[PDB]
Design a protein around this nucleic acid. Structure first.
Ligand SMILES: Nc1nc(C[C@H]2C[C@H](O)[C@@H](COP(=O)(O)OP(=O)(O)OP(=O)(O)O)O2)c(NC=O)c(=O)[nH]1
Ligand SMILES: [Ca+2]
Ligand SMILES: [Ca+2]
Ligand SMILES: [Ca+2]
Ligand SMILES: [Cl-]
Ligand SMILES: [Cl-]
Ligand SMILES: [Cl-]
Ligand code: NA
Ligand code: NA
Ligand code: NA
Ligand code: NA
Length: 326
DNA sequence: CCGACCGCGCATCAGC
DNA sequence: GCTGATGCGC
DNA sequence: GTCGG
């Protein structure tokens, strides 16, 4: 890509601020700067040319000047050399180990994959499954496999109740040739913003997918969100497929368009769009878009019949899923 | 200069 | 047990 | 770290 070297650098800086510094606003600041540079359609020639972009300020402009002249960033070179930063950045790659847990583990002397595998008793349930599938979870999922996964989920949900609708969102819905994981939005007519006329609507679907050996593990599970692990079936004498992360979100059926907008993303796109919503006097979540009054208190939910209706309210021209890949 | 930074589900824990 | 803060995740 | 006011 045109400015791959710059966007990798800013991403690495973002990950540092998140995992090591625990500086969530600097994490987001670097993430925004990398997103704006990633869509910029010219090979960047200077930090001043970059500073023209929104979210690229003086500090990042200087770093870009250093990177263009030398090919590297001294600040990152020292971060890479530091053992405590390096250890924390490694441990956070395990699902369920965050910045706080990573640092506590480093305090206890647990800081390699080997260390973790000797100390399962110190892990909670989520962290133990994340360690179990550490290698698998870092592999990408070819779109071809995403299509077989889709076919299984949709057909099994059909068997439980023909009135369920399951929609695969995330990067898959944005047209990616490969995805980090599978995200399934679920609706059923018995669950609306007005009533829950049936219990266990999510459980019954999880149960069916466990019964056919598609869902293999559970990281977390409540009434409306499932976070777990799944796996495609393999043929005779073939290696098994990698285990994959799956997220399932049950959304009230009358709030589908807000839900599918949220679950399609991207994450940075959602943040940019929600940040822009507030500037226009609205607040958007996965359920509703609501006006902000004179005091800053959210008003009642505005009518939505389409994804486009949401872009309209905040005066954005509609963007197809494939162009929301910020 | 400085306030504000997207919004929320589930798990875990301290205080009562 | 409950509630609110915090951790971690989407 | 960056931005709007
Ligand atoms: N509002 C908001 N939403 C999200 C997650 C949303 C948007 C994302 O497209 C969707 C699924 O998350 P996931 O991590 O699977 O991302 P996805 O875009 O599918 O990428 P990938 O799986 O890595 O190919 O939930 C965020 N997560 C990360 O940015 C976030 O920070 N803010
Ligand atoms: Ca995904
Ligand atoms: Ca996901
Ligand atoms: Ca495996
Ligand atoms: Cl911060
Ligand atoms: Cl909606
Ligand atoms: Cl709401
Ligand atoms: Na700028
Ligand atoms: Na992690
Ligand atoms: Na072991
Ligand atoms: Na197996």
């Amino acid at each position: 890509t045109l400015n791959g070297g710059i966007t990798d650098m800013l991403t690495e800086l973002a990950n540092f601020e998140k995992n090591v510094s625990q500086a969530i606003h600097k994490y987001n600041a670097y993430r925004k700067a990398a997103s704006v540079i990633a869509k910029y359609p010219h090979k960047i020639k200077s930090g001043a040319e970059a500073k023209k972009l929104p979210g690229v300020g003086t500090k990042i402009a200087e770093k870009i000047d250093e990177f263009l002249a030398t090919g590297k960033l001294r600040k990152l070179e020292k971060i890479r050399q530091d053992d405590t930063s390096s250890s924390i950045n490694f441990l956070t790659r395990v699902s369920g180990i965050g910045p706080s847990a990573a640092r506590k583990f480093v305090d206890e002397g647990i800081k390699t994959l080997e260390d973790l595998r000797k100390n399962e008793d110190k892990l909670n349930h989520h962290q133990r499954i994340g360690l179990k599938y550490f290698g698998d979870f870092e592999k990408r999922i070819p779109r071809e496999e995403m299509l077989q996964m889709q076919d299984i989920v949709l057909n099994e949900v059909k068997k439980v109740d023909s009135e369920y609708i399951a929609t695969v969102c995330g990067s898959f819905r944005r047209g990616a040739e490969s995805s980090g994981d599978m995200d399934v939005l679920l609706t059923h007519p018995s669950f609306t913003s007005e009533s829950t006329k049936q219990p266990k609507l999510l459980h019954q679907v999880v149960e069916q997918l466990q019964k056919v050996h598609f869902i293999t593990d559970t990281l977390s599970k409540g009434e409306t969100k499932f976070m777990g692990v799944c796996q495609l079936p393999s043929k005779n004498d073939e290696k098994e497929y990698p285990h994959r992360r799956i997220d399932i979100r049950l959304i009230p059926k009358d709030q589908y368009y807000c839900g599918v907008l949220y679950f399609t993303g991207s994450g940075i796109f959602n943040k940019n769009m929600r940040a822009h919503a507030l500037e226009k006097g609205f607040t958007i979540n996965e359920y509703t878009i609501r006006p902000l009054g004179v005091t800053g208190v959210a008003g009642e939910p505005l009518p939505v019949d389409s994804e486009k209706d949401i872009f309209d309210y905040i005066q954005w021209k509609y963007r197809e899923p494939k162009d929301r890949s910020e």
